[PDB]
Amino acid sequence: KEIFTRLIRHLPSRLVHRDPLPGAQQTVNTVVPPSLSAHCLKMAVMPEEELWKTFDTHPEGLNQAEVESAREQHGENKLPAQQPSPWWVHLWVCYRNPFNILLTILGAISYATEDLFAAGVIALMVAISTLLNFIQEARSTKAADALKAMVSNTATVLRVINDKGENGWLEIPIDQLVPGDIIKLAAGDMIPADLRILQARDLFVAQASLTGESLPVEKAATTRQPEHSNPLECDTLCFMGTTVVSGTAQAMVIATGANTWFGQLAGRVSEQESEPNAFQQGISRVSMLLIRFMLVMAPVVLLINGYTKGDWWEAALFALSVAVGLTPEMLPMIVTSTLARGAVKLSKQKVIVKHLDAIQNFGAMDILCTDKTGTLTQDKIVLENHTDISGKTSERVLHSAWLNSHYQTGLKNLLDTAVLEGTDEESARSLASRWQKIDEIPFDFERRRMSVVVAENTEHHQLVCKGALQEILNVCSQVRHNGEIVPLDDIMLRKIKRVTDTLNRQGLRVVAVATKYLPAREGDYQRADESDLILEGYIAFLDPPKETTAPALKALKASGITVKILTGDSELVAAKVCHEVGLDAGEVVIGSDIETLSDDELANLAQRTTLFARLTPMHKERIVTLLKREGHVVGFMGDGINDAPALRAADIGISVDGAVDIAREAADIILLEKSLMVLEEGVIEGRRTFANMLKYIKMTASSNFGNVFSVLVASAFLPFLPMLPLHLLIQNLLYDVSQVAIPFDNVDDEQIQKPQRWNPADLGRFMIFFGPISSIFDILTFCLMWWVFHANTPETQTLFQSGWFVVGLLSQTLIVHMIRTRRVPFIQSCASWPLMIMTVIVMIVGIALPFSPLASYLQLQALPLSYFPWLVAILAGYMTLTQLVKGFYSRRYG
Amino acid sequence: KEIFTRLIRHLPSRLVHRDPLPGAQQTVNTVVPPSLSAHCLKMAVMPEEELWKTFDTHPEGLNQAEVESAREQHGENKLPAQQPSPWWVHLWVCYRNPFNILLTILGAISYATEDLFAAGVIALMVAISTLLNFIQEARSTKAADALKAMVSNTATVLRVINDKGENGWLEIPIDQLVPGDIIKLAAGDMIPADLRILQARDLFVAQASLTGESLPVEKAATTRQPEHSNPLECDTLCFMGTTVVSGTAQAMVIATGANTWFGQLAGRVSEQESEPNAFQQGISRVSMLLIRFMLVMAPVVLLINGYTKGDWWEAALFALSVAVGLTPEMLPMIVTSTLARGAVKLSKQKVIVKHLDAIQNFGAMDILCTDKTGTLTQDKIVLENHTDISGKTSERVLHSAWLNSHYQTGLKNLLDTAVLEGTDEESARSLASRWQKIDEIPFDFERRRMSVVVAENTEHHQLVCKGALQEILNVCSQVRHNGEIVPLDDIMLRKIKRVTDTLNRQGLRVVAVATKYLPAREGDYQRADESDLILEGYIAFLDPPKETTAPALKALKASGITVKILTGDSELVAAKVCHEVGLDAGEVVIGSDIETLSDDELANLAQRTTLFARLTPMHKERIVTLLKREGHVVGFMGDGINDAPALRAADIGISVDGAVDIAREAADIILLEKSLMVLEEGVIEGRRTFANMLKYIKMTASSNFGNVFSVLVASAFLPFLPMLPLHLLIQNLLYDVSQVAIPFDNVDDEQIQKPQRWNPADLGRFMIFFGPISSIFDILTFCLMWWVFHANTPETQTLFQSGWFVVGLLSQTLIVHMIRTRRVPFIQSCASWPLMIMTVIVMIVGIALPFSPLASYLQLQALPLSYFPWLVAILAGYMTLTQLVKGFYSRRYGWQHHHH
């Protein structure tokens, strides 16, 4: 009957669940629909002269009023699942709960005849509960949205600043982009919307997400392709979700938001998120458990009281009032508030959480995959030697590397920075004023080199390519030895291999450089122009390991996290780095060994292997996917161009604020600095946050089930309701006010010591265990008020009901300090000061409520002074019994 | 009347002032106490057999009852200035101050005759104030003592771990040593007490502090020299305050505490600590200022009220009651409570403060002198190339270095660790089995080498020495080139020099290794045996800069601290490291350059020089001393054997928890980890603590001066006391209770952005400026109570006095939020939550006291409800006026004294 249970209010699918991330592979629904492919094809070949009039765009850019007009016309650069609802809509959906409406209707029906100010006060209590829930949810979702917007991909636009009318280059969030807006693209920038290249040089974009081709594709300002016949392959348009590999460009936004190629009929807008993740499934399962409890218990109470006291319209109200404590509507408030408090406290620790549910995984992660550069090493190399094949230092190698590092337009490397810094000013200036760039062949993993074609004159050009030693040697036919040029024979090949292996075993990364002279040519150089090269030498450099890497790794191992290194570098350098930081590399697995293994074989091998070397991005993604095989939660750390699938293939993806745009787009956690200590501290605090959330749900559900059980067992014998439903609503409201400060509780270090596994079925066991314990003392209080205080007849019922009230509210508020931890309270474990203060305040308010002037309005009678010793005895006995009985639940259940 | 000043109570000279360190050297105030000297000469040559009976010591050690017996008989291993006084003595000295005594005496005199229960309650208020002060001082002194005991030099002793009699080797604090205790000594351990060596293995100790000789000397189990004639030069006794350079030993304690040669006569006991440091001088100046204010003001109030009301025994009591607000007895409570709260907080930042006054220096530091190794770079090296002179990798060089590193007993080095770890297990065990140790020639700065003599047989011995390249080359005559021993000509010398200079310019430190073969002999090896050596090669290793050194240096510069590098390494490696970490080396000055310079020349040069290289410890000490030339507070950070003179020479000395014993003993601050980020954060926190202390002192002084001024100007016109002195005592007590939370206040980041400078004369200007400003409103309240509320006669004086009381306490309590910060409160700068809570609580108590049942007992009368709007108006006007007037004080003099 789950199809009929629509009482659950799901959290918005931006606080939980991931973003679409337009990387949903090559599969497309009928390859886009008509009037979209045709529109893109028309836009590709549309002359640039009439392009300005179509979008009301000018070369100066867009001013304010124009950008707001365009945003109103075309919407906002977002997806329909990212716009928050208005606060009044949220308040209305919080009030239209199928339980609040029923409570108000039953209050009216019971008290429409000859007794007002009762239905009104019940409705007012319902409104106060709704307002409290709405306030918590709204504050927490606002904080979550602010934290998500803190780390957002930005685009560089013209716009208008200096209202006297001066252009500029503003970095604005990609959601503010409107159609017909001018942006500029450099290396590492993801495409923010469907573009139209106005003017570009050496612009290469990686489109493996959309067209499925790994090699980057050159994108020119004006089309040079004979026929298009396809919108995805035209060289003048750039689609959202792809990254810029190298070169520079300036383009115009043509589509925006849902109108983008991916955002319409190519993903995102195709159906919805039919499959929920682990966190959503767990929340739904807990909500279903609570609904089952209510639907099994409340009708029984209704039937019993209707058969006994013959007031059905009041018995139903009373049963609903006791059931409301077990409502599922507590779940959105609890989850949102606790996870948002955890996310804010993480943001104070240089950890930004993009969606709330990731916190669960960030506490459940037991395997952490990453690269050795930046996380284990310092990413800045200290020592570097530019030598030829004979070991002697050579200035020609340094100058060739300087050319290749200066005229390249790709992302800045550590070698590129060190080469540009280690070259003196005079020689650098001479080379810059003597050589000029012509062409650039970017970096791809099929050949693992990078080429730059420069020239000092108009007669001949020089192609200078640098890359890993083996890849360079594969395409070198001559070597410059002793100032002469000699064929690269096998003897020199093996000598170079041995010397470079010896260097690699010292932790020195070796990058070879080759140059070739070609006649002047008026055509674009291709990857086929990297043959018969002249090997100048190599550069050996040391990226030293961080001082805070070994303690961080030890702390991560203490927390239960297994660290695995997925690197594309050499096996020897990675092994040396792992040994220098205390990591046990064991036997290494290179990427060429897993290309023949089956999925089962590689999944079994990756569990024992610690270091994986010479991996392509596909290998990293496959390893991350197969490491989730045995119920493990895998976290992948990466900040590269090609880390988009792996970051998404992991159970949790972690990136850095200084990453490329797609790495931040595909990540779930963003670290403000690339450190493992920050990651470990964040994992600890997220474990505390998720433990607090579980504790809050657990205690609330258990106490409310105890109250419902007490009502169910001890209402048939009484000739009146044990507690008036108004008193129940006040009790629940004050308990919720007390519980507001549970997100701020303290968590034992023994609870967050190991990765957290969340079983929603444990809540049922906890409720069953800790409900009857409260019910026993509830029945004891009933007997005390029946016999000791002689509240026998209905006429003197207000003494009885109020007599339970101060017991119902106080114990429910005190039991929190007993069942929160697993140890003995107040000596080995103490609740946080905000929780202590809230408990004391709520206890004081509950004690003083029967004595307050409002007690006459709330149908509460004052209490004789002889009742307080009995109340203290009951509370102390309840606390002692639960403290002595916790051990049985600990042993038999957990 | 400087001699007449017995009112000032100084803090114990352990929270402030540095403990005596045994660096006296050429200092022999008492020269030689013959009685003491005769004892050593007898102890040195006394046979080991009868040594056990003299000190009641057994070879297995001492059990419990014996160790407490020896401690009771011989005292504890401490100096007389380090024993805390018992708590009851502290309470008595807190109660017997000449102001708590005169107050009670005058209360008895005034209220004995037919007006009892008034002198009693006055004495009760005085006792409550005394108890509050004593509790604060005792708690903070206990916290400071615990912090000092956290980082204390320890000694390894036998003792008795088990009830059955099993012996152990316990690390006990050096103060727990009793005479006749058996300890063991290794490299880097300082001598904790006078010792008699029971057994030794190549034990070399540095006695440069006592005898003034830099070269370490050999200590043997039995004497090997013909005549001693001098207790300090006997080769079988070790004296406290010296360090063990190398070797191992087991010795017996023969003297302890004051009885130690250093402790008695030669040092410490002679004379006393006549000269105080800067913090003690500032505290004394503040106390003298407060005493002068009281002595100027209180007699005038006494005379005025005696001539007006004709009750001298009440007028003097009243004047004393208003004056007590300006007592110096708050200074021990103010200083101890505020600083300790900072120090404890610093203990949570891995910064342990050994004595409280160091905090003032630690926030006032503007020049920081450190070494490049450990602070700027990691102490673990990543790359190393063991090659010969031709550049080819050589296994023989690595094996010789492994022998030298394995068989040396000195302090472990980074190169030693790298060489021990970089040799494979099979070859390492083969070398260990094949070679056995014979002798060791330790490291000293005159030659800057270290040698180990081993042997594979009984025919010949091999001497393996290692050290800096030039020092090894000076004593090398041949070189092993291409497997042949060839004479080391000048061409090879120049080639090696240029190759190693190229290596050094890359940040690589080069350590040369030489070996020699000698015929077997029986005598010990000397420094003259390092000649005609054979240079095997050198080891070039990379010590990478720390990841966090550049941000820490940027933060240190942003905080106003100028970092200077004093290193004994080569100038090329140090310059490369400085460039890597972002520091500007500028022009490097080597140690040999400054030897011929004068004091003025070197002092002028050190101010514009960032990196000093090739420095002997004497050069480091001289540079640190001369860097204090013009109002500069110098901090020296070192963790070496020879860094004690440089640590004690600086205005503040910072060391590391893992340092050698003498480095920790000579330091003022101990960092739990060797990091510059920790140092910068601790400096910021100490600046906050000192700002809070100064703030605490200036506010209590200004408000109480304002109250005294109001009384002086007003009480002449009135026909009765403006406030009963009982109410004044209550007001002062409640204000102190409110101010208890000041140590926990917040400090603006503007007050901690520069090295602080403390001027005791600024307090007088602050008091003069901010007293009348609150006397204005006291006179306004007097007029309000006189005319609006018709308290015109003594019969209704109780309404008048209480009318001032609520104004007196709340304003004094509220004004704190106005004058704690230079900015406008509650919008830019807000007080800390404990301070706000205490302010609210004290205001509530002051309002509710006249309405309480105790009001009749305290001679307080209930206030009409029409008085509250006037009170609120007065408080708001006072706050607004002081806020609008703070600007004038800021412009004319500046809110704080700062800059370098």
Ligand SMILES: [Mg+2]
């Ligand atoms: Mg960008």
Ligand SMILES: [Mg+2]
């Ligand atoms: Mg091109």
Ligand SMILES: [Mg+2]
């Ligand atoms: Mg209950």
Ligand SMILES: [Mg+2]
């Ligand atoms: Mg020791």
Ligand SMILES: [Mg+2]
């Ligand atoms: Mg010897």
Ligand SMILES: [Mg+2]
């Ligand atoms: Mg005043």
